[PDB]
Ligand binder design. Structure first.
Ligand SMILES: CN1CCC(COc2cnc(-c3cccc(Cn4nc(-c5cccc(C#N)c5)ccc4=O)c3)nc2)CC1
Ligand SMILES: [Cl-]
Length: 265
């Protein structure tokens, strides 16, 4: 109810398309004198909102928050994230963040997920492409509730129906399609790997279908050259086949902050 912001407050710059999605494109906005991201929803809507309304209660420095929505293809207002998504940023030929900085972003994602895990929310699509950065280089775990979409179709394979992020998905999800907090831990492992390779595509010489047999043979992603061993030991623990022996997010926050603390820059 309070989520519903009035139409005269929100401006939407349709020519400046900042993101692109399946359900709708993400246009630039200016709510009045603050900057915004306005996500459309062109192409179910009744069902999508009731799950989304719970988003407003959530607040945490490393989780994306809801500013509001405007009814009229209803528009979803979201805080403007200056430095874009995290997959685009670490690849960006401009900012050269250190190994420490990359481990810092990963630690920040651990805290966003620790929060959401404490609320019993399963993300289901945790990846560098679905995490944003603000002016202060704070990582915000996004793509959940009303912000939920596909923002880069290449990493989603098309019998089931709904398109799945196979290369980020854990072994039980690939076989069953049942997602959990311990499955989200697998995805986090893959995301950490992205940070240490600076946004390299996981499993470059592998088809979208073939990851289940690949993983079952006893294979994992290799250790990146500048990935410090302890972090590789963490990455491997996240891909433990028993979704039980995998580490909790509170343990991930604890262990990674220890690793982060051992660097200069
Ligand atoms: C060159 N260009 C200059 C402008 C820069 C800043 O532009 C922005 C782009 N997007 C936002 C934004 C903010 C809040 C919420 C969302 C919605 N949302 N989007 C994505 C998303 C956005 C873009 C690319 C990809 C991928 N792959 C994924 C993921 C999760 C999610 O929840 C978007 N803000 C600013 C980017 C670089
Ligand atoms: Cl930090």
């Amino acid at each position: 109810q309070h989520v519903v912001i009035g139409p005269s407050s929100l401006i939407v710059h349709f020519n400046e398309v900042i993101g692109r999605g399946h359900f709708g494109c993400v246009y630039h906005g200016t709510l009045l004198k603050i900057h915004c991201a306005v996500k459309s929803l062109n192409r179910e809507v009744s069902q999508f909102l009731t799950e989304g309304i719970i988003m407003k209660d959530f607040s945490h420095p490393n989780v994306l928050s809801l500013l509001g929505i405007c009814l009229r293809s209803p528009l979803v207002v979201l805080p403007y994230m200056k430095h874009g998504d995290l997959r685009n940023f670490i690849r960006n030929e401009t900012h050269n963040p250190t190994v420490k900085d990359l481990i810092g972003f990963g630690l920040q994602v651990a805290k966003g997920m620790k929060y959401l895990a404490s609320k019993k929310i399963v993300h289901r699509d945790l990846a560098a492409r679905n995490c944003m950065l603000d002016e202060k280089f704070t990582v915000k775990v996004a793509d959940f509730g009303l912000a939920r979409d596909m923002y880069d179709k290449e990493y989603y394979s098309v019998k089931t129906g709904a398109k799945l992020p196979v290369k980020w998905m854990a072994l039980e999800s690939l076989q069953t399609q049942k997602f959990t907090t311990k499955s989200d831990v697998w995805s986090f492992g893959v995301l950490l790997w992205e940070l240490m390779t600076r946004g390299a595509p996981p499993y470059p010489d592998v088809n979208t279908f073939d990851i289940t047999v690949y993983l079952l043979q006893g294979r994992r992603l290799l250790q990146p050259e500048y990935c410090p061993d302890p972090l590789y030991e963490v990455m491997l623990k996240c891909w433990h086949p028993k979704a039980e022996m995998r580490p909790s997010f509170s343990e991930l926050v604890s262990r990674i902050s220890a690793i982060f603390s051992t660097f200069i820059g």
